[PDB]
Amino acid sequence: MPMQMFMQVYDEIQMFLLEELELKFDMDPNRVRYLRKMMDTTCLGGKYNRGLTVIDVAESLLSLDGARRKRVLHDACVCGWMIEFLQAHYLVEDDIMDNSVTRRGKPCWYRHPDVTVQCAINDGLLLKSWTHMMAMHFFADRPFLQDLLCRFNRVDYTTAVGQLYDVTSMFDSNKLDPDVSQPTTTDFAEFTLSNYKRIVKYKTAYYTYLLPLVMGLIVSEALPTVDMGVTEELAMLMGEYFQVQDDVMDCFTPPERLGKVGTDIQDAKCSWLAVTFLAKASSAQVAEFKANYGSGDSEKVATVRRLYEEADLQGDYVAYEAAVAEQVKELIEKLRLCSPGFAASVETLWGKTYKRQK
Amino acid sequence: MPMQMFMQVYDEIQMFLLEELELKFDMDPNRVRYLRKMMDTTCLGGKYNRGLTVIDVAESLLSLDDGARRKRVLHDACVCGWMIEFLQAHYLVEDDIMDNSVTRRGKPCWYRHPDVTVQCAINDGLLLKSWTHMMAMHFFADRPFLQDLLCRFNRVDYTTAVGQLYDVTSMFDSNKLDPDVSQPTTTDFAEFTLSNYKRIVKYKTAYYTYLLPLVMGLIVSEALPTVDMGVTEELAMLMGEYFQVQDDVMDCFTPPERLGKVGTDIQDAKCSWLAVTFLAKASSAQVAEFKANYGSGDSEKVATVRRLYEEADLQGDYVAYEAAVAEQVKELIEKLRLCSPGFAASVETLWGKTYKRQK
Ligand SMILES: CCCCCCCCOc1ccc[n+](CC(P(=O)(O)O)P(=O)(O)O)c1
Ligand SMILES: CCCCCCCCOc1ccc[n+](CC(P(=O)(O)O)P(=O)(O)O)c1
Ligand SMILES: [Mg+2]
């Protein structure tokens, strides 16, 4: 059922935005059609975990007239599309930054035959413009509007800061200087767990975990009823683990199941696998990694992969996952004490995360 | 005087932004330094025409206490001025990438800096926009005008992004515009019309360059409704169109040494004022020569397009266009003057920075 109201609201949103462009922005039906295709290609096709979480948190909190339920759940649906549109935006631009080929078993937006890279960049930011435009339209008379926008913008900013951490992680930050060219790091001295945890906290955790929970609480008018200290701890922990999962799958999960080809090795990313391998590797193994990392050459890539399985990384992953589950279980119970319906929805979100195959 | 106060506020904004990153966002000193340099390079060094207009509008409406209002209003105007300046910074970073440009204000484009990767350039460009919101939320947190300011600022930003879509798809036959299918640059240029030019330009330039600074100056001085907005918008659209026509003409005919940027319109096959004006008046023979030479990087092909423009007396058309604009502007400024004398004067001042600019 939630998927049904969600997809009805997508149409509501799509119609408001495309008709506004027709009527107030002088747009021709040729471009309206292009934008319609763009929206559908970029915003649909996923599992909508972020947006569906907003709905579930809302449905979990309606208690702590059936008109209110209808209004609150519609508000949640709009909020859910705001995060789905935001991630739509993030992924269009990220695929460009990461030189990716496919996404959900289709070409990346910028990789479509009639999308130029310069138009893809612009399309990507229109997606983010729509997130604000939809909020202002659907929530114009809602008192939570200001708080919602403020929190949403902070999270977006947080994510762009994390993207900076990601995209500059393979350059020696002491040598960071607009005026001087610098090659990829050769010593990898910054590929540390502490540095990994920072990239992933900022670029993933806030928008993937905190934001949906927070938006769910806002449309419920229930925010100040939860322990926000514990909520953020939980969001940071699940968010980190989610990105470790993403990083592991990038290397080890068949692209046909993932829907996308991995680029982290080629792009010389500070992944979970890279940091954890380098922390434990022999000098000999580090030498071979350095000789093979961050190149498109397919044997070099397979070398890195071999090194990873040689150093029992999957063993380290299982142990990390159990340590995470342990901490997540504890925090949910701390949450259960004063917010049992909210704690229930966090458990459901955790259930969508723990040991996902995707 | 305005530049003095304006630059003090720049320091104030920079400090807030970069300290917040260090204190709240776990940012290391190396990246705080990169971001400071990125901010200075992208935001400083221009004419600050947009930002200085906000201050001027506000210092003009400071007619309609102990001196406290004035200090507050002028500071707010300075912050809004930097909001547009940062927004313009954001547009130029991303536009130079999109336009395959090489220099900007006589230095390399941001994405052309030796130690800036294109992927970082894209993100750096976006941080600049994020900063416009963050500076507004901090400095204006207790102002009643906050929501209105943010609503209008955002509407203008979105307008500008729509204009950029118009600009970037102008060389493609829109009937064949299709994500799934590759298409070359147009060969008939049937959409290179003045009607299509006027829309590209209204959206990508006039709203953020002309309307927005005027509106923000009115907001911080709390004078927004005191003004005929139909006339004001008319003015901004006319002035903004002219400015872009000027930008387009300079792209072709002003030495990069005075421009501070190397022109890319011919090479990028842009629906420029020159191209649409030429195509409307040109003989069949001239048109066929243009078609053979437009949208190519080859230095011989671009020189042909310059020659065809000279041959067709486009400098003659421009002078008459400019004269026609100047007349309508003066008429509209007088309509404003009746009930809005202070604001009309600031609009006259903005016109003065625009008309026959040597930029
Ligand atoms: C102009 C746009 C500015 C950039 C905005 C921030 C982009 C944040 O993009 C993100 C954040 C988290 C995950 N992802 C996608 C992930 P993937 O789906 O594996 O490509 P990854 O980190 O591994 O690349 C993209
Ligand atoms: C990721 C955000 C990118 C899209 C945001 C909209 C960009 C609009 O940029 C604009 C709008 C108007 C003039 N300019 C610069 C002009 P120039 O300074 O001559 O390069 P032109 O139109 O000829 O390129 C840039
Ligand atoms: Mg990616």
Ligand SMILES: [Mg+2]
């Ligand atoms: Mg990435």
Ligand SMILES: [Mg+2]
């Ligand atoms: Mg990945």
Ligand SMILES: [Mg+2]
């Ligand atoms: Mg451009």
Ligand SMILES: [Mg+2]
């Ligand atoms: Mg340009």
Ligand SMILES: [Mg+2]
């Ligand atoms: Mg130009």
